């Protein structure tokens, strides 16, 4: 039972008996497992087709963009500083991979991260710039987040980090399943705190479906070169590919535009279907 | 005939003469924790028959204007006998369920109800300027549950929001079309065929055991697929009965007293 061909079709003749495959009861919740041979006459044919690439592994074997991170490299005195940028890791900033993942309730998988970096000038020539090097540091929850592009935190004694040189092939790393529970949960119908009757109101309030305050942490990105007289702007694009994935409890797909991290929906976008007629082909 | 059934749990028992069948969600029966999958090390508590018994909720009336009903578990049973006491005296808990919906009519009535059991049944709020902002009190109505609506009306009191849901019926309350909800465990009550539905729900979660006061594992939704009408306004009652199964509690503390209003 691995990439094997689907079952063959048999031959059937006329039927005259007290057996009624076509009559069933949808009320019971089960689906009638019929085949064409149970209702029409058929010829024998050898089957060759297989379901090898509708599987869960092949359905998630695509790298999908999830974020774009922007940093600058210019004299700090200018109106816009040498902007190191902070991004909190999530897949809900985009809709495609989010929609694909939310076909299910729980899942386990390893992740593959790919980074593509591009840069460009913003003013008319006025010289050039030497090749730039970027640092991408992972800041797990509880660690100190950088507050300046040249802080002590960038020593990365224990934090993982990647140094990337412009013009080279994209960077890539892998990470295991890092959940504190036995599987990730795409939905959580609950709260993180209970408001107690004997306690003041403000002390028990919480967001709906928040679960852990922040699951996985932060990515910090900067240019390592000091500065150039000319401003240079660069962007980093993050791509995700789940590996060795498992899933449970399928769900209906999203039918309307997303609105925030939750299942909420916005007014004026609740009419997905279009016009048709009952007796029109 | 195959339409007759009898079920007994503890000192409770049920008999039916016009049942379609019983559905077990995902074909799994409720069970206790195995030694190879138990995270906490303390000795659990199993009240057994003292809590594993059928409880009857308040009945509701089905008319032409009804849009639907929904409940949450274990929230709906928070005030039921010793089950609620064990829920509030302990930090951790888990259990399965047996849900039985009862609705009968004469041979001259018509209509249909769709009964769905959904794990992690998130619902959409009413605010259009904030997200995930509904309050605990409104999100847990108890044994009275809530109702679906046919239209979306966003709240506009930005300085004093109501902080409550607004589930549209055809979007199933969560942005997904109703017609696709049959992917969840379900059973249809068609008045011409059967007059009851029974569902067996095992414990489903990403954790072996969790807090019962903060998190709801299952949700129950009943919506009319075909409107009710009768020779002619028509009205018939729907009553709901639920029994915890294989319930287990851990982490005994002093009792919790949540703010319910």
């Amino acid at each position, epitope marked *: 039972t691995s990439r094997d061909a689907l079952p063959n079709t048999e031959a059937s003749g006329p039927a005259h008996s007290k057996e009624i495959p076509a009559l069933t009861a949808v009320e019971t919740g089960a689906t009638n497992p019929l085949v064409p041979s149970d209702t029409v006459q058929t010829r024998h044919v050898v089957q060759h087709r297989s379901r090898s690439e509708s599987s869960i592994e092949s359905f998630f074997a695509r790298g999908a963009c999830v974020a774009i991170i922007t940093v600058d490299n210019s004299a700090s005195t200018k*109106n816009k500083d040498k902007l190191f940028t*902070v991004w909190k890791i999530t897949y809900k900033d985009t809709v495609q991979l989010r929609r694909k993942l939310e076909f299910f309730t729980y899942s386990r998988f390893d992740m593959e991260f790919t980074f593509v970096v591009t840069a460009n000038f913003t003013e008319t020539n006025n010289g050039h710039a030497l090749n730039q090097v970027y640092q991408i540091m992972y800041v797990p929850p509880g660690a100190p987040v950088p507050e300046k592009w040249d802080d002590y935190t960038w020593q990365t004694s224990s934090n993982p980090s990647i140094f990337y040189t412009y013009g080279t092939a994209p960077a890539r790393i892998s990470v295991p399943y890092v959940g504190i529970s036995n599987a990730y949960s795409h939905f959580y119908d609950g709260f993180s705190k209970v408001p107690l009757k004997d306690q003041s109101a403000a002390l028990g309030d*919480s967001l709906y479906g928040a679960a852990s*305050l*922040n699951d996985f942490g*932060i990515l910090a990105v900067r240019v390592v070169n000091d500065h150039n007289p000319t401003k240079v702007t660069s962007k980093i694009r993050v791509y995700l590919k789940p590996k060795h994935i498992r899933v449970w409890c399928p769900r209906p797909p999203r039918a309307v535009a997303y609105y925030g991290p939750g299942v909420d929906y916005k007014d004026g976008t609740l009419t997905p279907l279009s016009t048709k007629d009952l007796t029109t082909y | 005939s195959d339409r007759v059934l009898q079920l007994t749990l503890g000192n409770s028992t049920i008999t039916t003469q016009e049942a379609a069948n019983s559905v077990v969600a995902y074909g799994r029966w409720p069970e206790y924790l195995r030694d190879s999958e138990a995270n906490p090390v303390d000795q659990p508590t199993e009240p057994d028959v003292a809590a594993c018994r059928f409880y009857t909720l308040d009945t509701v009336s089905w008319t032409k204007e009804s849009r639907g009903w929904w409940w949450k578990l274990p929230d709906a049973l928070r005030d039921m006998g010793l089950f609620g006491q064990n829920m509030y005296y302990h930090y951790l808990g888990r259990s399965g369920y047996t849900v039985h919906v009862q609705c009968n009519a004469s041979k001259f009535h018509q209509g249909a109800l769709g009964v769905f059991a959904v794990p992690e049944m998130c619902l959409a709020g009413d605010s259009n300027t*904030t997200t995930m902002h509904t309050s605990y009190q409104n999100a847990n109505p108890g044994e009275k549950g809530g109702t679906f609506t046919g239209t979306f009306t966003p709240d506009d009191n*930005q*300085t004093s929001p109501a902080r409550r849901f607004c589930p549209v019926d055809y979007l199933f309350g969560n942005g997904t079309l109703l017609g696709n909800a049959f992917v969840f465990p379900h059973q249809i009550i068609n008045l011409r065929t059967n007059n009851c539905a029974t569902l067996v729900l095992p414990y489903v979660n990403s954790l072996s055991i969790d807090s019962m006061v903060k998190h709801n594992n299952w949700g129950i939704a009943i919506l009319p697929l075909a409107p009710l009408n009768f020779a002619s306004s028509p009205e018939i009652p729907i009553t709901l009965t639920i029994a915890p199964m294989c319930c287990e509690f851990n982490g005994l503390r002093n009792i919790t007293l949540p703010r319910l209003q």
Partner: antibody
Amino acid sequence: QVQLVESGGGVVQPGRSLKLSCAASGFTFSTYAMHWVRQAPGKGLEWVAVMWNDGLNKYYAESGKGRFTIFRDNFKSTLYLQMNSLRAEDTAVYYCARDRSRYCSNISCSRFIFDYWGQGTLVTVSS
Amino acid sequence: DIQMTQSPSSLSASVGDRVTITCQASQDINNYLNWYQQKPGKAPNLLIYDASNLETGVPSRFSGGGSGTDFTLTISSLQPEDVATYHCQHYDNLPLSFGGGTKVEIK
């Protein structure tokens, strides 16, 4: 340099209500906590309230507690302050400021250092 | 709550002088204090944080010190454009609070 612009200030009769707004630009609004600080004419600074970038958790100083309300709209990148029962002692210039608490909803991991300030809007309680 | 007391309320000095300003706390707050500068008709500007760290872009003639209940801001050599009001601000715990402010003027 980010941009913070306040508006809504003006003359208000005693005992009435007023609403202030602060529009933010040049940065990701929904990842920072925002503050209100006021300065009476010729006096020192005075802190009012904070909100921890989620729209739900907040804190008020004892001067305006009970009367003032702070809320935000992350989709429009705007901050609001609703004032009720205004007294003659509430006359001051109101500033909206941004601290370094980025992904934080608790005092434990916040740190209140104000990097940016707005131009300020004047509120006068007189008749 | 914590009360911040600043002294002197105002002072005068000649260009090139060494000026010192003190902010005092009603209880020990480790090193949770900031300093701000506010020129007439403008919003405050951050000078020091953590009671010793100099904000980027600030002239090196500003420096902060102290710990516990006593803190100090000093200007090594006063310049014409330093005339402004100076505030101290603590963040030991909520609610936050500022000092009374100190005016600096040329003699």
